[PDB]
Amino acid sequence: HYDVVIIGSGPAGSLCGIECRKKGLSVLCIEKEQFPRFHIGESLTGNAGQIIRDLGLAEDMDAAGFPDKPGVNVIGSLSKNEFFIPILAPTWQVRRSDFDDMIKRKAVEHGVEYKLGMVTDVIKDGEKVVGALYKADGVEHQVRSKVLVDASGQNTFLSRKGVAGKRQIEFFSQQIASFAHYKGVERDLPPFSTNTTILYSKQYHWSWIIPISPDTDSLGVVIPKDLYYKECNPDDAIAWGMDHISPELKRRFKNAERQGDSQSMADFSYRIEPFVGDGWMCIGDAHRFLDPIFSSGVSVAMKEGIRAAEAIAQVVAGQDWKAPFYAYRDWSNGGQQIWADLIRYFWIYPIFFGYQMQNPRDEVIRLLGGCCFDGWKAPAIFRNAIEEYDRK
Numbered sequence: 001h002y003d004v005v006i007i008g009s010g011p012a013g014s015l016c017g018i019e020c021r022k023k024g025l026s027v028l029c030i031e032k033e034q035f036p037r038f039h040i041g042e043s044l045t046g047n048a049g050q051i052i053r054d055l056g057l058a059e060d061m062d063a064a065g066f067p068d069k070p071g072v073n074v075i076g077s078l079s080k081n082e083f084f085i086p087i088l089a090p091t092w093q094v095r096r097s098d099f100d101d102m103i104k105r106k107a108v109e110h111g112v113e114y115k116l117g118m119v120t121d122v123i124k125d126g127e128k129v130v131g132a133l134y135k136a137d138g139v140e141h142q143v144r145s146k147v148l149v150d151a152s153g154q155n156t157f158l159s160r161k162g163v164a165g166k167r168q169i170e171f172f173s174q175q176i177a178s179f180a181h182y183k184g185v186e187r188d189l190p191p192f193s194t195n196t197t198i199l200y201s202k203q204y205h206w207s208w209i210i211p212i213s214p215d216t217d218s219l220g221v222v223i224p225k226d227l228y229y230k231e232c233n234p235d236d237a238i239a240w241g242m243d244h245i246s247p248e249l250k251r252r253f254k255n256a257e258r259q260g261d262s263q264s265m266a267d268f269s270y271r272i273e274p275f276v277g278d279g280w281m282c283i284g285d286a287h288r289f290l291d292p293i294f295s296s297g298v299s300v301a302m303k304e305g306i307r308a309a310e311a312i313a314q315v316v317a318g319q320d321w322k323a324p325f326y327a328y329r330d331w332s333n334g335g336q337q338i339w340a341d342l343i344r345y346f347w348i349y350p351i352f353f354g355y356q357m358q359n360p361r362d363e364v365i366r367l368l369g370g371c372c373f374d375g376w377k378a379p380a381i382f383r384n385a386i387e388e389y390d391r392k
């Protein structure tokens, strides 16, 4: 028996476990993969940076060789339009295998119990979730929980089991990402050498370059699903990007040497509703995924883990789940909708978006730093333009 059982130990599950422990709750985290393990999504927001400082991890970040992130340089190729989004507060580019392991060790330090295992089923008592089944070695185990937290990322465990809602996928923005790590990439000149670079051409055609260590850079090429299936495996997709997205690519990778195989993965934005219920909740990618063009996923996952523990504590302490879980739900929907709007606005009006950075700018900087979860003008501008556009 535990107060809280967390499925998965990415940024959402790890932060949820840490904050649950800070509220004095007993916590079991079941994670199916042995750490450290590779994972994509390497560029952090200023707000993720602040959580990391709060955990007391800043020195360890520098020690791990994670480059400082000055901001993101966005370059459009069809018109050479270029803009730079400065970082809100100091943050980093990370190798996720090592980063996720660091956060996980902090969770263990706070007294989270970990099991290597794959959660496979929930245990119900009528409508109520009261625990879970998981496989470790050759063997099925049972655990009982007051709240089962699904932090399974894009595995969307509770959705797949029909406990949570079905995925509602955004049909018009379906993309496939292909990526690999390289050495020998030409970096921007200081003070910008370790910025994230985003290159885009047509709508939903884009690429990233992220320095993740002193010598290594992550390259991604992201294109519409149909184009990928039509003209492209992940090697071919990356080559297509090198050829068609921007000349900056062939230039910077002139002397680059790939480390390890390339990979592809769905980049479909989705949302799952409901994502809270009696005895359970979802946090992070387990209920919602946004186009990672602005590198917000880890920041969002961490924030949701933190905010969920608040709700969880109230329920473990005897309050009916509705008021607290619905407050979490509404808080999450509020902030995620702002991110979603920013992204849709960018894809519709990428040039107008950029120029916004010369407009007396501060709001967007804060928003892209992650301040999306707390009167600002920007959210309404994005919302209004998108509604008009859709109506048109």
Ligand SMILES: Cc1cc2nc3c(=O)[nH]c(=O)nc-3n(C[C@H](O)[C@H](O)[C@H](O)COP(=O)(O)OP(=O)(O)OC[C@H]3O[C@@H](n4cnc5c(N)ncnc54)[C@H](O)[C@@H]3O)c2cc1C
Binding pocket: 007, 008, 009, 010, 011, 012, 013, 030, 031, 032, 033, 039, 040, 041, 042, 043, 044, 045, 117, 118, 119, 120, 151, 152, 153, 154, 155, 157, 177, 220, 265, 266, 267, 283, 284, 285, 286, 292, 294, 295, 296, 297, 298, 299, 301
């Ligand atoms: C192409 C791409 C690029 C991205 N770039 C960025 C970026 O630059 N910056 C950024 O911040 N975000 C980025 N993201 C998003 C980011 O990767 C995710 O939002 C983030 O990892 C979410 O964290 P999570 O904890 O929710 O899920 P995850 O990090 O995926 O963690 C989930 C964990 O759950 C475990 N698990 C799953 N199912 C089970 C089960 N049944 N039992 C036990 N354990 C289980 C998995 O092993 C996994 O470790 C990107 C995403 C994509 C697709």
